[PDB]
Amino acid sequence: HMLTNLVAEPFAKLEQDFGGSIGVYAMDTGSGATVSYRAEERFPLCSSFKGFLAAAVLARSQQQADLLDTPIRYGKNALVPWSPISEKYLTTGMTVAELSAAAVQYSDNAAANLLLKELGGPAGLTAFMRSIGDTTFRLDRWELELNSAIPGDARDTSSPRAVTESLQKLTLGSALAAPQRQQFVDWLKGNTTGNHRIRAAVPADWAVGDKTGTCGVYGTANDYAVVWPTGRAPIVLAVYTRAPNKDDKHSEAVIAAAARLALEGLGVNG
Numbered sequence: 001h002m003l004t005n006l007v008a009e010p011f012a013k014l015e016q017d018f019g020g021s022i023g024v025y026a027m028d029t030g031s032g033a034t035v036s037y038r039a040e041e042r043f044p045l046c047s048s049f050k051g052f053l054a055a056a057v058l059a060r061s062q063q064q065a066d067l068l069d070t071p072i073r074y075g076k077n078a079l080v081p082w083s084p085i086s087e088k089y090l091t092t093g094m095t096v097a098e099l100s101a102a103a104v105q106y107s108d109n110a111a112a113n114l115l116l117k118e119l120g121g122p123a124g125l126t127a128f129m130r131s132i133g134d135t136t137f138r139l140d141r142w143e144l145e146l147n148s149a150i151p152g153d154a155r156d157t158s159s160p161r162a163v164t165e166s167l168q169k170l171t172l173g174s175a176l177a178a179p180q181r182q183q184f185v186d187w188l189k190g191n192t193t194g195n196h197r198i199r200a201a202v203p204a205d206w207a208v209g210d211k212t213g214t215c216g217v218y219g220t221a222n223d224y225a226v227v228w229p230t231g232r233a234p235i236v237l238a239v240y241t242r243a244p245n246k247d248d249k250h251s252e253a254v255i256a257a258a259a260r261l262a263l264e265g266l267g268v269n270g
């Protein structure tokens with residue numbers, strides 16, 4: 001607690017202007033200092049579970065050396081809405097590694113469902129998260145049902161804090177073996193969907209990997225990232241939003257603004 005919120009930031013004004021709730025947890029991995037706002041509340045994961053999904057696939061690949069190269073063929077019935085990569089390879093198939101990259105970097109929904117099946121479904125991904133010490137994360141449903149974002153419904157949710165803690169373990173800690181850790185980082189660095197979220201708050205000369213989520217209802221959207229400022233230790237952070245009404249709109253700008261406040265709260269000159 002001594003190093004939590006050393007510098008107050010106007011998160012309450014930001015969420016009031018947004019018309020909803022914002023949850024933020026940011027960790028300076030050098031000093032241990034944190035910024036924390038609504039950090040232990042639950043927010044829907046939406047597409048953001050797909051980063052942890054890819055990490056779980058990489059963990060499995062440490063015991064199954066042929067897993068990532070395995071070619072997966074799928075039928076048209078697998079192509080649920082928002083499958084921009086897998087729809088281009090319907091007639092050819094794609095490897096497990098390619099599906100993982102597509103789930104992370106293009107948020108591909110068919111790819112995510114196919115990989116969930118490899119892991120034994122939502123309970124299998126939840127079990128992986130438990131195995132790294134995350135007692136908050138839960139996945140309960142598949143794409144697209146997991147995006148319903150119903151107020152008060154704990155299904156398919158985590159907390160900003162647990163998201164950040166698990167992201168740190170998987171990208172910087174020892175939850176994955178070193179080759180798999182670097183592959184996970186590389187997939188996150190190559191994300192294409194987050195340019196208007198945490199990345200918009202991070203200087204262009206710093207490295208950053210992220211995964212976004214956009215449930216499409218209840219103003220519910222999010223992003224988590226690992227950021228490597230030059231000359232100081234990496235920062236890990238998570239920004240989640242939700243709002244009371246089904247037709248409330250999400251805001252990318254609010255996520256970027258919350259990330260800026262988090263970095264300011266850590267004293268990171270950006």
Ligand SMILES: *C(=O)N1C[C@H](NOS(=O)(=O)O)CC[C@H]1C(N)=O
Nearest residue numbers: 046047082107193212213214215
């Ligand atoms: C994830 O939340 N989804 C996948 C896709 N875009 O993902 S992103 O916004 O997180 O990059 C479409 C929206 C959404 C969904 N409804 O599955």
